[PDB]
């Protein structure tokens, strides 16, 4: 074991873990939506379909 | 120094360089330079010792002289045309005065003498700010007036800077002086391509800033300011030594490391307009920078220097304050060559 | 005579000697501001007399 | 929130936690004295935290678990070999002296950090300011060379200047023959080899250098063997002192902030102990250094950070 | 006993899947250079009555 | 600099509306894959520096690294493609606008072009 | 039997103020470990 | 051709994800499998090269070199797992990572269709070799050697880059196919002369030339066994491949410009053959033999005739294999005796008979014994030079004699005579060393069965 | 150009040379800097008044303001130098070399 408090505890800091996971998910869905909007806009501007 | 005072001085330095880089008036640019110098002087003296005091004195004297000649150039340009806008600046005498003033502010040869000394006197944190951030404003002013720059003077000063940095770096054992001479050589490299294309100047500035940042934060992590003190960290943090060797290889300019991208590009940009001798001279001279980087790498990681007994105690303790942006800086300093074409986003 | 003496003397050893001499000459400054500020004055005069005189 | 510049910016200051009972207390005495029991009693009566004397394996009790490590991995020196063979040709004497000085420096940093963070005082059993008496005793007896004491002086000059001296210094004065009698009566087979000249040199260095120097910055309370048992009297003398001469009342909040940022992060505390000075006693070759470092890394809880060692039962690693 | 053997020898498929991915990548690269398929003056040829491409 | 001064150029846009007429890079673009690989390498280096199990210390941190690198790389690639397209468009427009400076020369065949022969001997 | 590694004699070349010591720079002293020169006994 | 490149980039993490005692087995097995896969590029069209994509193409000159590199990696792994037994797991993995990165860079170098990419990878090969030499050497000179091995290269190759970009500013492209199809003669002018020098000097110093060979003995002596293998077998052939690729544009300036280089190559081949006789070291003799053979290859490339090109390719492959085998044979004795002196351990035939047989076969293949591919390349080069000038044979003939002499000299000094009477730690040869020798020697005979695979595109 | 402009420019050049000569002291160089600033102020105000640039009239004043800052800065450093050495001589600033 450790005689010190071990600032990294036996369980992770769930606040920071949740913040990081939420940030990753938000960025991924934002990228997906942005790509969809961009391809739709390109198709509309070029008149392809 | 109080943390509030320190952060407000840093913010004032950044505000001064922002004022330089966003102003269309010559007087506002001069005001930004003055604010930058005034708020930068105490930052060097955060840790008080006679060496820091004399480094601050030399820096202040050099910057004050440069500002004086810069203002004289502005006044002469106003005299020969009632224009305040930062523009072509047709007058040759005023343009020469401004070129010399900005060269002294940057540290180009033969105005390089203050760079190795001041870096030696100040702390690594202070030194990092001086070598990285204090180059944006003069380079921006040079970029705005690049079309009027006389190629002969600028190229002569750039070649002198490269030669002097390469030769001076060969002799130093202190890490801060090595970094200062490397900075002089890099300033020469970026200044060389300025009359032809400022996009390459900006790209070289970005890559040099990334490499110098990674170098300095690695040096701060293993608190060593000399070659022998750096020869001990293999017995404490070998990963730091390996990353440091890779970063030194990148700074040397070896491919496929990122440090090869600016030089190559610059050479290409100088070949598009019938400049052949000068890039060859620059490459053969930067071989010297590579040599002393290689000597540092030999002393640091590729060999194992004898250690001390008390180092055993250091084995039981961890580094408390951890720099967040160090891994990103290392990665951008080494593995970013295949994304070379993205430089088109810089114009 | 050829490999260990003269081929070493011409390309590598001469280069090392010249670079060492130049490094010693460049990096030997006493640190006094007076001397290299006088050098700054000389540089300013040379630049203002040798570059912009012809336009 | 871990203390730092931001924690200092809003809220937390140091001078608002000092309750006039900080009183960094250092108890000094010659070999085999009653200084340890006196220090424990003073700490108990005054309500301060007692710091036992920094041994060879003091740093082992602060990291990981309190169990000491092997002598090869920590210290690389022994007191018994110094007592049996003080003039050994492997440089054990100065290696032990330097390791003990570094351990005392670490203990002083720990005590200062505790006092600044909590406000409760500390009672040490020997400080870095009185560690040089053993060095002078070794040098005068020919146990160590002059280059060793020069290296020690350089390390002390670059290290001890960053801290503050103890508020009050307590000295227990015991005559040399009484010390020899107590050593003989103790029973440890190695301490019976301590010559009288060694103890005499220790006490001479003490009385001639340490106390006169500390009298200019602190308050010195010399005692005797007979009056060192009634700890109530010494507690009364301590609590009826006039603390106005040292630099402690001349400390501002910024100075305390800098000192607190320095005492934690023990790497900066021990930075200047391993200066690149190549003395045969302390210098270690590359091969032995590599072997010993590899051996230390293979310890059960020393491979990774103190919270990322699955060997010692740490869980949820992949989410920390 | 699949657990231990799999957890110890899962590294023995990285090279084969790398080879398969390399073949797949070559084909993808291949599909982008069909600008002159069945248009060379030397190999121009009328199609079979069921085939649609000369080569893939 | 050549493209710093250009008519109808908003200063700090980083992505003009005119750039929306170009096809966006695919999400499986090899450059985006390299950006994600760079993020993974940065995460591994972060794990190594902090003295943590390099491969599997923090999965959320590595995921955030990769996501941030990919997110920045998408827009960087978009801007780079826009800049190259603009350069090509300007070059073609200038070539068309000045036919005298880029004339169509004759197309001679090798049967009438006389090239001197260098024997190897 | 084992790979050669630097010793004290090889390490001491990088201990001076500068490499390539000439007669003029032979009296140059290396800077103090902490960048604090000792106070001068200035009689004022 | 990503089916070969990707498996190497997968060899990297599987090496980094293997068990502590299973790294060598996995590395050897999968490197052998990758070499077997790369053996499929030998099917070459007689008309033109195989153009897989816009970046990678394979010719009749590239395929034997690729096969040689992919076959080399397992041999280096086998030879490296003897002196690295006491190393830690992380450093062993780092060594294997350096070897894998070097192979990957070589593979991408030999097939790059664009000259700037070829230069980038041909210079990227410098970092792993330098790290290996300066980190896993044995003596204190290795650092110096590394410095030489770096700068002698870079000072010769930095101008080339400029020339390359200059060409791209003049012709408009650097793709090899466009360069070959749109090639135009070079007029006689100082500008074109310096362009020729810039394009040639890098590959000249990478061979190396006689006057620029000083780095090779240092690099090949102070490097570990695998470093010596990769330096003497494939890393030398980079200059020859580059010259054979770049001489297309240099005509007709080459005929005037090749006289000093041809003279240097011939006289230096004679000089290095003579130097091999009076050598007290064992690895230096092999290094100077490599120098002589590469000088012959330089002459072949410079005279620029199809027979010379065929002989150059054959000699390159044969010399790579033979020098690798000789270095391994010397390394076994060095591990036995812990010294590099040639006359220290004598009469080893009475103690190690099979190793004596391997030494005899390697020495026989070193002195161009018929019908081995060494003699095929040497004889083609000699015939081409004789057509170039009837006097050259004299020099060539001289070299041949000297070659045989020093080869047999070594074979007589280390194997024949009586033992030293005081080296009692010469254990019997392991299975690993004999297997390494057999895997070195059998491909030479198998290739001399079917030589058209290693005769290059001019066949 | 009239003789007044050339006299002001010559004064600025003389002040710049005097700053660059560095005889013995440090206050003398600060005086040279202040003289250069005064010459710049005079030149700027003469140019502004001659061409009737109305809005530019506050330009010199701002100049003067920053001049004060520079002077203050220099004086501060001088004090520290004195407190380190008891004398403002520039010969003592030689702890750092190139
Ligand atoms: C593209 C171009 C990119 C830019 C070029 C490179 C930029 C380089 C910047 C140099 C900055 C120097 C520095 O901070 O040290 C480097 C630092 C390492 O230094 P360190 O030893 O950790 O620093 C010790 C502290 O400075 C010890 O200082 P302290 O404890 O006295 O300070 C307390 C602390 C805590 O601060 C506070 O308490 C905040 C209080 C708020 C008060 C608000 C007052 C407002 C006015 C009234 O404040 C700081 O640490 C510094 C704050 C800086 C704020 C900047 C605002 C803009 O690492 C970095 O800063 C990262 C480097 C790379 C930055 C990103 C570059 C790309 C973007
Ligand atoms: C072109 C193709 C790609 C190539 C690109 C380049 C290579 C990749 C990118 C590089 C960056 C990524 C990794 C670097 C950071 C890692 C840090 C580290 O130290 O690693 C140790 C770490 C072992 O540590 P551990 O396990 O925690 O426990 C042992 C302790 O750490 C005990 O540790 P220790 O500290 O006690 O050990 C001492 C050691 C510790 O020091 C080191 O280990 C050196 C660290 C490497 C330097 C980082 C350089 C930064 C990146 C620049 C790369 C330049 C590339 C250009 C080519 C030139 C190369 C110089 O120090 C020494 O031994 C000193 C010897 C001096 C040697 C000088 C050479 C140093 C430079 C070598 C750089 C080579 C390139 C990186 C290759 C990968 C290396 C991990 O290695 C790993 O386990 C991770 C390696 C990567 C894992 C890949 C797995 C991927 C996912 C698995 C599945 C695969 C796909 C599955 C799907 C299949 C479909 C079904
Ligand atoms: C023409 C001959 C026909 C033979 C038919 C069978 C051929 C089988 C070839 C097998 C592949 C070669 C293996 C070489 C590695 C040695 C293996 C080994 O350790 O054996 C130990 C084994 C057991 O002995 P031990 O008691 O353990 O030995 C203890 C000590 O080590 C004591 O050991 P030791 O004292 O017995 O030493 C080994 C022995 C033998 O070991 C060796 O020396 C092997 C190296 C041979 C010469 C290498 C340099 C020349 C390269 C020429 C390349 C030709 C390629 C042909 C195709 C090869 C396909 C693999 O030493 C010698 O015999 C003197 C070597 C010098 C021979 C000079 C030959 C000049 C060229 C002959 C003409 C070649 C083309 C013919 C057709 C021309 C057109 C009509 O003994 C043997 O197996 C001896 C093998 C028989 C000798 C073969 C000599 C001629 C080989 C020429 C190539 C094959 C030609 C096939 C086409 C038909 C002809
Ligand atoms: C070498 C690695 C460098 C990396 C740099 C840091 C990367 C992360 C930082 C986040 C990037 C955001 C910064 C800017 C985004 C919004 C601001 C935007 O409006 O800026 C505009 C456009 O943004 C910038 O101009 C370009 C930013 C793109 C930076 C990437 C270039 C890196 C070099 C290529 C190597 C590959 C690196 C890959 C990185 C992962 C400015 O337009 P403009 O007012 O008209 O410019 C005037 C000055 N000029 C004309 C002389 C240039
Ligand atoms: C005009 C400027 C042109 C610049 C061209 C220079 C290219 C770079 C070459 C670098 C050479 C630097 C070597 C040097 O000066 O150091 C001397 C050094 C002393 O060793 P230290 O460890 O530093 O000192 C410890 C004792 N106190 O001497 C040595 O040991 C030499 C070691 C490296 C040898 C490398 C030789 C390579 C030269 C081959 C040709 C390359 C030259 C480049 C031009 C070629 C001509 C076109
Ligand atoms: C191991 C050490 C080996 C060192 C080898 C280094 C020497 C390499 C040979 C010279 C390299 C530089 C040549 C330049 C690169 C080619 C570019 C080019 O061809 O452009 C020429 C320009 O050519 C030059 O400018 C060359 C100038 C050379 C300056 C540097 C000299 C280096 C040393 C000279 C002697 C080296 C040659 C022999 C060395 C042998 C090895 C020791 C044409 O000029 P344009 O702008 O197009 O205008 C013409 C139409 N009006
Ligand atoms: N700097 C030092 N050098 C050598 N020995 C030391 C040093 N510091 C402490 N010691 C040893 O620590 C031992 C225990 O200390 P001491 O106070 O005399 O006994 P006790 O703990 O019973 O009171 C002593 O034998 C002393 O020699």
Q: Is any ligand 5 atom within 6 A of the Cβ of residue B295? A: yes
Nearest CA in chain G to H335: G1
Return d(Cα C35, Cα C23) in angstroms, integer. 19
Return d(Cα B186, Cα B188) in angstroms, integer. 5
Return d(Cα H199, Cα H204) in angstroms, integer. 9
- The DSSP code sequence of C6-18 is IIHIIIIIHHHHH
Q: Is any ligand 7 atom within 6 A of the Cβ of residue D34? A: no
Return d(Cα H167, Cα H179) in angstroms, integer. 10
Angle between helices H283-303 and H259-277 (to 10 degrees): 160
Helix (H) or strand (E) holding H40: none
Euclidean distance between the first and the last CA atom of chain G, given in angstroms as a whole number = 65
Residues 6+ apart with CB under 8 A from H154: B287, B290, H123, H126
Return d(Cα H143, Cα H137) in angstroms, integer. 9
**Burial bucket for residue C10 (CB in 10 Å: 0-12, 13-18, 19+):** exposed
The nearest CA of chain C is from the CA of G24 a distance in Å of 9
CA dihedral B314, B318, B319, B322 (to 10 degrees): 170
* D229 among annotated binding-site residues: no
DSSP state of F109: -
By alpha-carbon position, which residue is closest to atom 51 of ligand 3? Answer: H372
Contact of B216 with F20, CB cutoff 8 Å: no
Q: What is the 3-state secondary structure (H, E, C) of H332-369?
A: HHHHHHCCCECCCCCCCCCCCHHHHHHHHHHHHHHCCC
CA dihedral B253, B257, B263, B266 (to 10 degrees): 180
Residues 6+ apart with CB under 8 A from H92: H23, H84
Helix (H) or strand (E) holding F35: helix F30-49
By alpha-carbon position, which residue is closest to atom 95 of ligand 3? Answer: H445
Contact of H342 with H279, CB cutoff 8 Å: yes
Q: In 3D, which of H257, H371, H264, H265 has the Cα closest to residue H308? A: H265
Burial H303-316 (b: 16+ CB within 10 A, else e): bbbebbbbbbbbbb
Three-state secondary structure call for residue D220: strand
Contact of H6 with E18, CB cutoff 8 Å: yes
- F5's torsion region: left (phi>0), alpha (psi -120 to 50) or beta? beta
The nearest CA of chain B is from the CA of I12 a distance in Å of 9
DSSP state of D187: -
Phi, psi (deg, nearest 5) at residue F83: -65, -45
* Domains held by chain F: number: 1
Q: Which of H204, H214, H217 to mutate to test the interface with C (most CBs of C within 10 A)?
A: H214
Report the half-sphere exposure of I60 (CA within 13 A, side-chain side): 16
* CA dihedral for D309, D312, D318, E3, sign (positive or negative): positive
Name the residue range of residue F52's domain.
1-98
Task: Give the residue extent of every domain in chain E.
Answer: 1-56
CB count, 10 Å around CB of A9? 12
- F8's torsion region: left (phi>0), alpha (psi -120 to 50) or beta? left
**C-alpha C16 to ligand 5 mean position (Å):** 4
Q: Which residues of F touch A34 (CB under 8 A)?
A: 74
Segment H360-364 long-range contacts (CB within 8 Å, at least 24 positions apart): H360/H411, H360/H415, H361/H441, H362/H322, H362/H325, H362/H326, H362/H329, H362/H440, H362/H441, H363/H407, H363/H408, H363/H410, H363/H411
Q: Is there a domain that residue F29 lies in? A: yes
Q: Which residues of B touch G15 (CB under 8 A)?
A: 173, 228
Return d(Cα D14, Cα D251) in angstroms, integer. 10
Asked whether at least 3 C-beta pairs link C and D within 8 Å, the reply is no
Return d(Cα E25, Cα H432) in angstroms, integer. 37
Contact of H9 with H104, CB cutoff 8 Å: yes
Euclidean distance between the first and the last CA atom of chain D, given in angstroms as a whole number = 18
Contact of F66 with F34, CB cutoff 8 Å: no
Return d(Cα D4, Cα D2) in angstroms, integer. 6
Q: How many residues does chain H have?
A: 459
Ligand having the closest approach to the CA of H186: 6
Task: Quickly list H helices, E1-56.
Answer: 2-9, 14-30
B262 touches chain H (CB under 8 A): no
Is the peptide bond between F90 and the residue preceding it cis, with omega within 30 degrees of 0?
Answer: no
| Sheet with strand D49-51: strands edge to edge | D49-51, D122-124, D25-29, D168-172, D219-223
Return d(Cα H328, Cα H440) in angstroms, integer. 9
**Burial bucket for residue D185 (CB in 10 Å: 0-12, 13-18, 19+):** exposed
Contact of H336 with H417, CB cutoff 8 Å: no
Contact of H248 with H59, CB cutoff 8 Å: no
Return d(Cα I97, Cα B185) in angstroms, integer. 18
Residues 6+ apart with CB under 8 A from H424: none
Euclidean distance between the first and the last CA atom of chain B, given in angstroms as a whole number = 41
Three-state secondary structure call for residue H281: strand
Return d(Cα H43, Cα H175) in angstroms, integer. 23
Which of B31, B38, B58 is nearest residue I93 as measured by Cβ atoms?
A: B58
Return d(Cα D169, Cα D128) in angstroms, integer. 13
Contact of D265 with D241, CB cutoff 8 Å: no
Phi, psi (deg, nearest 5) at residue B55: -65, -45
B171 to C24: CB separation less than 8 angstroms, yes or no:
yes
The nearest CA of chain D is from the CA of A37 a distance in Å of 34
Residues 6+ apart with CB under 8 A from D243: D23, D167, D168, D219, D249
Ligand having the closest approach to the CA of H450: 3
CB count, 10 Å around CB of I29? 25
| Resolution of the coordinates, Å | 2.9
Return d(Cα I21, Cα I38) in angstroms, integer. 19
Three-state secondary structure call for residue D221: strand
Q: In 3D, which of D185, F120, B274, B9 has the Cα closest to residue H308? A: F120
Instruction: Count chain A–chain F contacts defined by CB atoms under 8 A.
Output: 41
Return d(Cα B84, Cα B74) in angstroms, integer. 8
Q: Is any ligand 6 atom within 6 A of the Cβ of residue H203? A: no
By alpha-carbon position, which residue is closest to atom 25 of ligand 7? Answer: D31
Instruction: Count chain D–chain F contacts defined by CB atoms under 8 A.
Output: 23
Return d(Cα H138, Cα H223) in angstroms, integer. 8
* CA dihedral for H350, H354, H360, H363, sign (positive or negative): negative
Return d(Cα H201, Cα H246) in angstroms, integer. 12
Residues 6+ apart with CB under 8 A from H84: H91, H92, H95, H136
Q: In 3D, which of H117, H100, H116 has the Cα closest to residue H108? A: H117
Return d(Cα E55, Cα E38) in angstroms, integer. 9
Contact of I17 with C41, CB cutoff 8 Å: yes
Phi, psi (deg, nearest 5) at residue H51: -105, 95
Helix (H) or strand (E) holding F43: helix F30-49
Task: Give the residue extent of every domain in chain I.
Answer: 3-85
Return d(Cα B336, Cα F35) in angstroms, integer. 9
Return d(Cα F46, Cα F69) in angstroms, integer. 15
Phi, psi (deg, nearest 5) at residue B172: -80, 140
DSSP state of D283: E
Angle between helices H89-110 and H2-16 (to 10 degrees): 170
Contact of H372 with H365, CB cutoff 8 Å: yes
Q: In 3D, which of F46, F42, E7 has the Cα closest to residue H18? A: E7
Q: In 3D, which of B263, B130, B282, B112 has the Cα closest to residue B181? A: B112
Residues 6+ apart with CB under 8 A from G4: H138, H139, H140
Residues 6+ apart with CB under 8 A from D178: D225
**C-alpha B277 to ligand 6 mean position (Å):** 8
The nearest CA of chain D is from the CA of A31 a distance in Å of 25
Q: Is any ligand 6 atom within 6 A of the Cβ of residue H160? A: no
Report the half-sphere exposure of B124 (CA within 13 A, side-chain side): 19
Contact of H217 with H144, CB cutoff 8 Å: no
Which of I36, I77, I80 is nearest residue B68 as measured by Cβ atoms?
A: I36
Residues 6+ apart with CB under 8 A from H203: H238, H239, H240, H242, H243, H246
Helix (H) or strand (E) holding H21: none
Paired sense of beta strands D219-223 and D168-172, if any: parallel
Neighbours of chain C (3+ CB pairs under 8 A): B, G, H, I
Three-state secondary structure call for residue H51: strand
Q: Is any ligand 1 atom within 6 A of the Cβ of residue D10? A: no
The nearest CA of chain H is from the CA of F121 a distance in Å of 6
Q: Which residues of H touch F116 (CB under 8 A)?
A: 185
Q: In 3D, which of B300, B315, B309, B314 has the Cα closest to residue D288? A: B309
CB count, 10 Å around CB of H176? 20
Q: What is the 3-state secondary structure (H, E, C) of B164-190?
A: HHHHHHCCECEHHHHHHHHHHHHHHHH
Return d(Cα H110, Cα H122) in angstroms, integer. 9
- Please name the fold of domain I3-85: Helix Hairpins (1.10.287)
Burial H67-77 (b: 16+ CB within 10 A, else e): bbbbbbbbbbb
Instruction: Count chain B–chain F contacts defined by CB atoms under 8 A.
Output: 56
Pocket test for ligand 5, best of G6, G13, G16 (most atoms within 8 A of CB): G13
**Burial bucket for residue B295 (CB in 10 Å: 0-12, 13-18, 19+):** buried
Euclidean distance between the first and the last CA atom of chain F, given in angstroms as a whole number = 51
Pocket test for ligand 3, best of H322, H358, H359, H361 (most atoms within 8 A of CB): H361
Q: Is there a domain that residue F46 lies in? A: yes
DSSP state of H438: H
Three-state secondary structure call for residue D25: strand
- The DSSP code sequence of B285-345 is HHHHHHHHHHHHHIIIIIS---EESTHHHHTT----S--SSHHHHHHHHHS-GGGGGGGGG
Return d(Cα B49, Cα B238) in angstroms, integer. 32
Is the peptide bond between H208 and the residue preceding it cis, with omega within 30 degrees of 0?
Answer: yes
Return d(Cα F69, Cα A31) in angstroms, integer. 12
Q: Is any ligand 6 atom within 6 A of the Cβ of residue H201? A: yes
D65 to A1: CB separation less than 8 angstroms, yes or no:
yes
Contact of D66 with D239, CB cutoff 8 Å: no
Q: In 3D, which of H102, H186, H200 has the Cα closest to residue H156? A: H200
By alpha-carbon position, which residue is closest to atom 36 of ligand 5? Answer: C12
Q: In 3D, which of D318, H178, C43 has the Cα closest to residue B109? A: C43
* CA distances for H43 relative to H51, H61, H63, H456, angstroms: 13, 12, 9, 12
* CA distances for B300 relative to B230, B242, B306, angstroms: 6, 9, 12
Q: Is there a domain that residue F118 lies in? A: no
Residues 6+ apart with CB under 8 A from H328: H75, H79, H225, H229, H433, H436, H437, H440
Residues 6+ apart with CB under 8 A from E49: none
* D30 among annotated binding-site residues: yes
Residues 6+ apart with CB under 8 A from B305: B228, B231, B232, B234, B299, D286, G6, G11
Task: Quickly list H helices, H136-224.
Answer: 142-170, 176-181, 190-206, 215-222
Return d(Cα D9, Cα D1) in angstroms, integer. 13
CB count, 10 Å around CB of D136? 17
Experimental method: cryo-EM
Return d(Cα C42, Cα C39) in angstroms, integer. 5
C16 touches chain G (CB under 8 A): no
Maximal CA-CA distance, chain H: 70
Return d(Cα B95, Cα B195) in angstroms, integer. 14
C2 to H212: CB separation less than 8 angstroms, yes or no:
no
Burial D283-300 (b: 16+ CB within 10 A, else e): bbbbeebbebbeebeeee
Q: Is there a domain that residue F69 lies in? A: yes
Asked whether at least 3 C-beta pairs link E and D within 8 Å, the reply is no
Return d(Cα B9, Cα B125) in angstroms, integer. 14
CB count, 10 Å around CB of F76? 18
Helix (H) or strand (E) holding A15: helix A14-46
Q: In 3D, which of H407, H426, H433 has the Cα closest to residue H328? A: H433
Task: Quickly list H helices, I1-98.
Answer: 3-21, 27-50, 58-85
């Amino acid at each position: 074991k450790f005689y010190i408090r071990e600032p990294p505890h036996g369980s992770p800091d769930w606040l920071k873990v949740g913040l990081t996971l939420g940030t990753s998910v938000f960025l991924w869905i934002y990228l997906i939506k942005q790509h969809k909007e961009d391809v739709l806009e390109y198709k509309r501007r070029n008149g392809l379909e | 120094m109080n943390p509030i005072i320190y952060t407000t001085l840093i913010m004032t330095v950044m505000s001064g360089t922002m004022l330089v880089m966003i102003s269309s008036h010559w007087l506002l640019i001069w005001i930004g330079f003055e604010m930058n110098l005034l708020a930068m002087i105490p930052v060097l003296m955060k840790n008080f010792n006679p060496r820091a005091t004399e480094a601050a004195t030399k820096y202040f004297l050099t910057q004050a002289t440069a500002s004086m000649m810069l203002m004289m150039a502005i006044i002469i340009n106003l005299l020969y045309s009632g224009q305040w806008t930062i523009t072509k600046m047709f007058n040759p005498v005023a343009m020469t005065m401004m070129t010399m003033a900005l060269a002294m502010k940057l540290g180009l040869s033969p105005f390089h003498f203050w760079v190795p000394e001041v870096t030696q006197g100040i702390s690594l944190q202070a030194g990092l700010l001086l070598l990285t951030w204090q180059k944006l404003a003069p380079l921006s002013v040079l970029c705005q007036i690049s079309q009027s720059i006389n190629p002969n003077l600028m190229l002569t000063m750039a070649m002198l800077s490269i030669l002097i940095g390469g030769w001076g770096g060969l002799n130093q054992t202190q890490l801060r002086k090595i970094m200062a001479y490397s900075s002089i050589a890099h300033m020469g490299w970026m200044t060389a391509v300025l009359p032809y294309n400022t996009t390459m100047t900006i790209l070289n500035l970005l890559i040099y800033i990334t490499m110098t940042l990674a170098m300095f934060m690695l040096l701060i992590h293993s608190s060593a300011t000399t070659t022998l003190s750096l020869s001990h960290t293999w017995n404490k943090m070998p990963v730091i030594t390996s990353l440091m060797m890779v970063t030194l290889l990148s700074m040397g300019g070896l491919p496929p490391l990122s440090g090869f991208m600016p030089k190559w590009m610059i050479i290409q940009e100088m070949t598009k307009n019938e400049s052949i001798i000068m890039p060859t001279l620059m490459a053969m001279t930067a071989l010297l920078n590579l040599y002393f980087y290689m000597r540092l790498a030999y002393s640091s990681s590729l060999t194992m220097f004898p250690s001390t007994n008390n180092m055993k105690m250091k084995w039981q303790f961890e580094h408390t304050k951890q720099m967040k942006l160090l891994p990103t800086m290392i990665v951008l300093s080494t593995l970013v060559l295949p994304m070379t074409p993205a430089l088109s986003s810089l114009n | 005579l050829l490999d260990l003496i003269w081929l070493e003397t011409i390309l590598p050893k001469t280069t090392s000697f010249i670079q060492m001499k130049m490094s010693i000459m460049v990096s030997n400054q006493k640190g006094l501001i007076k001397l290299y500020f006088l050098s700054f004055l000389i540089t300013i005069m040379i630049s203002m007399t040798l570059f912009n005189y012809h336009e | 929130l871990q203390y730092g510049p931001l924690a200092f910016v809003l809220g937390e200051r140091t001078t608002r936690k000092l309750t006039e009972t900080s009183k960094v207390i250092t108890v000094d005495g010659n070999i085999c004295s009653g200084k340890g029991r006196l220090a424990r009693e003073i700490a108990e009566k005054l309500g301060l935290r007692h710091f036992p004397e920094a041994g060879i394996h003091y740093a082992d009790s602060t990291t990981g678990d309190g169990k000491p490590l092997d002598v090869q991995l920590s210290g690389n020196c022994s007191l018994e070999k110094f007592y049996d063979d003080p003039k050994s040709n492997d440089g054990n004497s100065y290696r032990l002296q330097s390791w003990l000085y570094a351990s005392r420096l670490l203990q002083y940093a720990d005590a200062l950090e505790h006092l600044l963070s909590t406000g409760q005082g500390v009672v040490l059993e020997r400080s870095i300011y009185s560690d040089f008496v053993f060095l002078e005793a070794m040098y005068r007896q020919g146990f160590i060379r002059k280059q060793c004491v020069e290296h020690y002086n350089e390390v002390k000059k670059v290290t001890a200047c960053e801290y503050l001296p103890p508020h009050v210094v307590v000295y227990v004065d015991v005559p040399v023959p009484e010390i020899q009698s107590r050593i003989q009566k103790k029973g440890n087979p190695h301490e019976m080899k301590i010559t009288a000249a060694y103890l005499q040199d220790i006490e001479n260095a003490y009385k001639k250098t340490f106390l006169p120097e500390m009298s200019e910055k602190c308050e010195v309370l010399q005692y005797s063997a007979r009056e060192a048992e009634d700890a109530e009297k010494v507690v009364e003398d301590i609590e009826y002192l006039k603390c106005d001469k040292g630099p402690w009342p001349d400390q501002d909040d910024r100075t305390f902030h800098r000192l607190r940022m320095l005492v934690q992060n023990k790497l900066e505390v021990l930075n200047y102990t391993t200066i690149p000075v190549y003395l045969p006693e302390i210098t270690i070759g590359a091969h032995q250094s590599d072997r010993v470092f590899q051996k230390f890394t293979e310890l059960p809880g020393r491979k990774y950070s103190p919270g990322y060692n699955e060997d010692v039962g740490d869980k949820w690693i992949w989410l920390k | 006993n699949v657990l231990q053997i799999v957890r110890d020898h899962w590294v023995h498929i990285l090279v084969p899947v790398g080879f398969v991915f390399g073949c797949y990548l070559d084909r993808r690269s291949d599909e982008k250079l069909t600008a002159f398929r069945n248009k060379s003056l030397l190999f121009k040829r009328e199609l079979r009555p069921n085939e649609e491409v000369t080569w893939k | 600099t050549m493209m710093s001064g250009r008519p109808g150029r908003v200063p700090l846009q980083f992505l003009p509306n005119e750039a929306r007429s170009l096809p966006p890079p695919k999400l499986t673009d090899p450059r985006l894959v390299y950006m994600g690989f760079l993020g993974y390498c940065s995460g591994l280096i972060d794990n190594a520096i902090r003295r943590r199990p390099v491969v599997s210390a923090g999965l959320h941190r590595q995921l955030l690294y990769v996501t941030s690198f990919v997110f920045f790389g998408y827009y960087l690639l978009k801007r780079q493609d826009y800049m190259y397209a603009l350069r090509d468009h300007d070059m073609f427009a200038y070539v068309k606008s000045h036919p005298e400076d880029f004339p169509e020369k004759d197309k001679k065949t090798y049967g009438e072009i006389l090239e001197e022969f260098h024997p190897v001997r | 039997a084992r790979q050669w590694q630097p010793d004290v004699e090889w390490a001491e070349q990088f201990g001076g103020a500068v490499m390539y010591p000439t007669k003029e720079t032979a009296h140059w002293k290396p800077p103090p470990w902490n960048d604090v020169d000792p106070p001068k006994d200035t009689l004022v | 051709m990503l089916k070969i490149i990707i498996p190497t980039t997968m060899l990297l993490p599987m090496t980094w994800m293997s068990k502590h005692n299973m790294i060598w087995i996995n590395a050897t097995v999968h490197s052998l499998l990758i070499s077997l896969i790369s053996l499929s590029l030998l099917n070459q069209l007689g008309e033109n090269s195989l153009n897989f994509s816009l970046t990678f193409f394979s010719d009749s000159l590239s395929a034997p070199l690729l096969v040689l590199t992919t076959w080399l990696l397992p041999l280096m792994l086998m030879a490296s797992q003897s002196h690295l037994s006491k190393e830690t797991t992380t450093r062993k993995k780092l060594y294997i990572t350096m070897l894998i990165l070097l192979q990957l860079f070589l593979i991408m170098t030999f097939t790059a269709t664009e000259l700037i990419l070829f230069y980038i990878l041909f210079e990227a090969t410098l970092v792993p070799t330098l790290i290996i030499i300066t980190r896993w050497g044995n003596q204190t000179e290795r650092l110096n050697a590394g410095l030489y091995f770096l700068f002698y290269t870079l000072a010769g190759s930095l101008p080339l880059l400029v020339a390359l970009v200059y060409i791209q500013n003049t012709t408009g492209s650097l793709n090899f196919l466009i360069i070959h199809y749109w090639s135009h003669p070079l007029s006689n002018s100082w500008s074109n002369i310096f362009m020729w020098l810039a394009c040639i000097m890098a590959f000249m110093v990478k061979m190396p030339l006689y006057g620029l060979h000083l780095w090779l003995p240092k690099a090949h002596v102070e490097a570990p066994i695998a470093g010596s293998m990769v330096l003497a077998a494939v890393l030398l052939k980079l200059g020859g491949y580059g010259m054979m690729r770049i001489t297309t544009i240099l005509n007709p300036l080459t005929n005037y410009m090749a006289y000093p280089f041809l003279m240097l190559s011939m006289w230096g081949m004679i000089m290095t053959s003579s130097i091999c006789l009076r050598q007290t070291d064992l690895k230096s003799l092999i290094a100077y033999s490599s120098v002589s053979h590469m000088a012959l290859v330089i002459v072949a490339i410079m005279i620029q005739t199809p027979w010379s090109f065929m002989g150059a390719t054959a000699l390159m492959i044969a010399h790579g294999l033979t020098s690798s085998m000789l270095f391994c044979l010397a390394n076994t004795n060095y591990e036995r005796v812990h010294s590099r002196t040639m006359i220290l351990a004598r009469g080893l035939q009475t103690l190690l008979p099979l190793m004596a047989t391997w030494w005899l076969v390697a020495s026989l293949t070193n002195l161009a014994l018929p019908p081995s591919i060494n003699l095929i390349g040497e004889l083609f080069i000699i015939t081409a030079s004789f057509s170039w000038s009837n006097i050259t044979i004299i020099l060539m003939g001289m070299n041949m004699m000297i070659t045989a002499l020093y080869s047999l000299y070594m074979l007589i000094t280390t194997q024949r005579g009586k033992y030293t009477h005081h080296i009692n730690n010469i254990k019997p040869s392991f299975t690993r060393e004999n297997a390494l020798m057999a895997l070195h020697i059998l491909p030479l005979l198998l290739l001399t069965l079917n030589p058209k695979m290693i005769l290059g595109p001019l066949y | 150009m009239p003789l007044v402009y050339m006299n002001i420019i010559m004064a600025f050049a003389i002040a710049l040379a005097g700053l660059l000569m560095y005889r013995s002291h440090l206050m003398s160089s600060l005086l040279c800097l202040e003289g250069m600033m005064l010459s710049l102020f005079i030149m700027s105000t003469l140019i502004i008044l001659n061409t009737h640039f109305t809005l530019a009239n506050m330009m010199p004043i701002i100049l003067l303001v920053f001049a004060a800052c520079e002077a203050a800065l220099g004086l501060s450093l001088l004090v520290m130098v004195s407190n380190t050495y008891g004398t403002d001589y520039v010969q003592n600033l030689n702890l750092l070399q190139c």
